[PDB]
Design a protein around this ligand. Sequence first.
Ligand SMILES: [Zn+2]
Ligand SMILES: [Zn+2]
Lengths: 199, 206
Amino acid sequence: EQNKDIQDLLDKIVFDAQHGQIWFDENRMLLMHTSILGFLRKDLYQMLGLERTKRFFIRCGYQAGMRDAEVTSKLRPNLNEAEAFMAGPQMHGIRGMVQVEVNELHLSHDLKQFYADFNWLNSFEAEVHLSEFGASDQPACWMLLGYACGYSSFVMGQTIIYQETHCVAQGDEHCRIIGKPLSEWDAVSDEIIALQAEL
Amino acid sequence: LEQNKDIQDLLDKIVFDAQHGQIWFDENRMLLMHTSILGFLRKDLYQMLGLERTKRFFIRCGYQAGMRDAEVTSKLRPNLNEAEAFMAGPQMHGIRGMVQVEVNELHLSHDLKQFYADFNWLNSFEAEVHLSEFGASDQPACWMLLGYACGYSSFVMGQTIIYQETHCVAQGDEHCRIIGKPLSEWENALIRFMSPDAVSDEIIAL
Ligand SMILES: [Zn+2]
Ligand SMILES: [Zn+2]
């Protein structure tokens, strides 16, 4: 019914409580509290400063994003590029991190062309950021953003960089990102962060 | 179908809302994550801070999570005895995909201030992660699980329960093992955060 489009991702996810294991394909998952992420964000901040913490959370999202794309790219290979790609936004929702809503998506692997304009609703990272830091001067959704780039870059076979254009933690109403190839704008965390120092 | 009779009161409270990007455990949001966030964290801190501060950090982060599950399951089993209610922490640890708890021994009394737990830990996510980043250890490596056991147990018992991991897959045993007793019964010897910080340094001196 409500899951027609994600059932193939659901079928890959196994909860085996009695043996202490959650599997997404052949990868272990953990169920964690968002407030623990908030705690870890704050503790790293104190120990290492904002840049290193930001760099940490983006790198993590980035590897997670690439891992999910390894797993989901084997699925759907009898479908067209947009439907396949949508596994990424879909995992973010299944994982409980954010709801992706597509304003605009243009993509072709062979053309090396990509452009995404998405809204992010109920970002967990904006919530835990307000909680620990109060209202922010900059977008807060570092991990989610890393995951966007990583997932997107694996699927397209080149560096796709995203920018969080509007963020719930800066008072905006929903979060929103725009994704394009590096040029139209791997330590790509440097780029994402450099990129956001563009007023 | 349901030999989850044990943990149904816990699963009952888990709600997945994939359309809306949300997972709930009671009123708390949760996430499903890759172990790589922790594997990364563990690598980054090992080289920026060294082993001792890395290990303290993970015990701290397990301790906060254990305490939190204790908060959320506190009022959960009023018509079972202390033990079967305590079992929620071990059970959550399994529900969360972290480790599987198999009891060798468990006796507790809140009011007699008595606690002994001897548990096998099987399938430790943390032992896998330590191995695939650091290889074999000369000592037990399940820091964050140990932190959890201690934060959870200390809350439930209203006092300092310290655990020791006497065997660990990370150092080539076949499963991990732990003994937990009150701080007063170990053969060696203000703010409410400041108390956690102390407990966390104690579970760290092994
Ligand atoms: Zn945001
Ligand atoms: Zn271990």
